[PDB]
């Protein structure tokens, strides 16, 4: 048996608050290992009406690593399925390994920029599907 959950999120603007590089090699390598593909250089930021914590579902964690003599911090990643209109595309949610409290904001990565492919504007609503399991 498997436990499934569905949550709704609205398109919100957010990019300057997050500061990292995707074009460099090591980011594409670690993403393709966890997801099996290299995500595009961008994010989809959704605001939810409910708090979210990746430690309530089964995610994959990656340890602290170094590249070109610089230290980068470990991160947690969990696959998702993104439903917009009548189409479903594979995506994933990304959050740093270090977390203090829980929030209602999640950032997603995808194979391509969803905002262009679906002509989506800020305020529009899309549905996210999360897979999980219960020991019972």
Curated annotation (Swiss-Prot):
Keywords: Flavoprotein, FMN, Kinase, Magnesium, Metal-binding, Nucleotide-binding, Transferase
Catalysed reactions, semicolon-separated: riboflavin + CTP = CDP + FMN + H(+)
Cofactor binding notes: Binds 1 magnesium ion per subunit. This ion is coordinated by a threonine and an asparagine, and by the alpha- and beta-phosphates of CDP.
Keyword Acetylation: no
Positions annotated to bind Mg(2+): 43, 45
Residues where CDP binds: 14-19, 112-115
InterPro entries named in the record: Archaeal_Riboflavin_Kinase, RibK_CTP-dep, Riboflavin_kinase_archaeal, Riboflavin_kinase_CTP-dep, Riboflavin_kinase_dom_sf
Residues annotated to bind FMN: 99-100, 107
UniProt EC number: 2.7.1.161
Keyword presence, Membrane: no
Top-level EC class as recorded in UniProt: transferase
Pathway given in the UniProt record: Cofactor biosynthesis; FMN biosynthesis; FMN from riboflavin (CTP route): step 1/1
Family classification: Belongs to the archaeal riboflavin kinase family.
Role, per record: Catalyzes the CTP-dependent phosphorylation of riboflavin (vitamin B2) to form flavin mononucleotide (FMN). Can also utilize UTP as the phosphate donor, although less efficiently, and it is unclear if ATP and GTP can also serve as substrates or not.
Subunit structure comment from the entry: Monomer.
Protein's UniProt name: Riboflavin kinase
Organism: Methanocaldococcus jannaschii (strain ATCC 43067 / DSM 2661 / JAL-1 / JCM 10045 / NBRC 100440)
Gene name for this UniProt entry: ribK
């Amino acid at each position: 048996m498997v436990k499934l959950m569905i949550i709704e999120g609205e398109v919100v603007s957010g990019l300057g608050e997050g500061r990292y590089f995707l074009s460099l090699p090591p980011y594409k390598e670690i993403f393709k290992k966890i997801l099996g593909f290299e995500p595009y250089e961008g994010t989809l930021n959704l605001k939810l009406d409910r708090e979210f914590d990746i430690n309530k579902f089964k995610y994959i964690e990656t340890e602290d690593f170094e590249f070109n003599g610089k230290r980068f911090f470990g991160v947690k990643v969990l696959p998702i399925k993104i439903l917009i209109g009548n189409k479903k595309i594979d995506g994933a949610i990304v959050v740093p390994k270090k977390t203090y409290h829980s929030s209602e904001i999640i950032e997603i990565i995808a194979p391509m920029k969803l905002r262009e492919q679906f002509n989506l504007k800020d305020g529009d609503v899309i549905k996210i599907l999360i897979k999980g399991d219960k020991d019972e």
